[PDB]
Amino acid sequence: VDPEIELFVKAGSDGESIGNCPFCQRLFMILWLKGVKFNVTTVDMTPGTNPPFLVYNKELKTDFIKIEEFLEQTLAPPRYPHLSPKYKESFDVGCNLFAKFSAYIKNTQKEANKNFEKSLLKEFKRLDDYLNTPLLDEIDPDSAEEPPVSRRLFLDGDQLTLADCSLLPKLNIIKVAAKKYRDFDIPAEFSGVWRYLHNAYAREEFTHTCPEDKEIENTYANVAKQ
Ligand SMILES: N[C@@H](CCC(=O)N[C@@H](CS)C(=O)NCC(=O)O)C(=O)O
Ligand SMILES: N[C@H](CCC(=O)N[C@@H](CS)C(=O)NCC(=O)O)C(=O)O
Structure with missing residues (x-):
């Protein structure tokens, strides 16, 4: 029983691959290290603004500094580790x-x-x-x-x-x-x-x-x- 999480990251040159986006990679790493189930979708940059953004139980989050603190807090023990x-x-x-x-x-x-x-x-x-x-x-x-x-x-x-x-x-x-x-x-x-x-x-x-x-x-x- 996990929350429903899709992380949207920036796509690379072919429009599908993982692109260069250090804040996207940061959130991808956070989610992986939390042990939670999640999907990653790449966005071809050739709604919200620039990636990354996150949909969490059907709710869109675009302020990505705020995404980090929400994930760290929300996904908490006993089920997931604090990563701070x-x-x-x-x-x-x-x-x-x-x-x-x-x-x-x-x-x-x-x-x-x-x-x-x-x-x-x-x-x-x-x-x-x-x-x-x-x-x-x-x-x-x-x-x-x-x-x-x-x-x-x-x-x-x-x-x-x-x-x-x-x-x-x-x-x-x-x-x-x-x-x-x-x-x-x-x-x-x-x-x-x-x-x-x-x-x-x-x-x-x-x-x-x-x-x-x-x-x-x-x-x-x-x-x-x-
Ligand atoms: N600051 C120089 C000249 C070369 C240079 O442009 N250095 C830098 C990089 S640490 C700088 O901040 N440039 C100042 C400028 O905009 O001209 C020196 O030591 O002679
Ligand atoms: N949209 C995919 C990117 C997704 C992706 O590359 N995820 C890999 C990293 S290479 C993964 O290890 N995900 C496993 C997980 O969700 O834990 C693509 O075709 O480029």
Whole structure:
């Protein structure tokens, strides 16, 4: 016995596939991690406004910040898990990452590239520090002292949370778009960032909600060319 849920997300270039839409992917991830039954319909953007929107027991919801808080609240225990993070810093971290990428990827002045890359890099470093630094709840299993490097799987702990549902779609877009148009690789030295990405891309709830890389590339084909 579940509620009736259809999530409407943005379609990709063929009008049917999953398109590039990080807020759509965020809600898709939330619903999957809740364990609730739901259908996903893609909307060809070539009623409401832009996706995502959601129909929940026959009622249309279009304010998508409000969709997130409604799902988290509504779909509650005992039946479904709360997905909110233990620590707020799990949200706060990376809150500026996408904006720094957005400036960098649309910069058309080759001479400013180094400065824009440095600004993106400063945010990656901040995320990396959050991910390598043990959370307050972490106890090394061999020594019972606080680990010298965090080994938790995700932002907030060993389970995917709302924080991950928000950030991972943004990280995928950055990874794909920046590589294609600026030949940028997330530095290998950001060992926490990569621990997190390898763990996340190991999860079907993340990888199978990603659009094909080409969709993301198509998004930036006209803004990211210098
Ligand atoms: N800010 C520069 C010149 C290159 C540049 O455009 N940098 C950036 C990216 S961090 C910027 O905010 N541009 C200011 C502008 O709009 O001209 C420098 O350090 O010499
Ligand atoms: N409308 C579908 C998108 C739906 C979709 O791709 N859902 C997949 C992700 S690839 C899924 O794993 N859904 C399982 C679930 O609802 O739990 C399409 O043909 O592109």
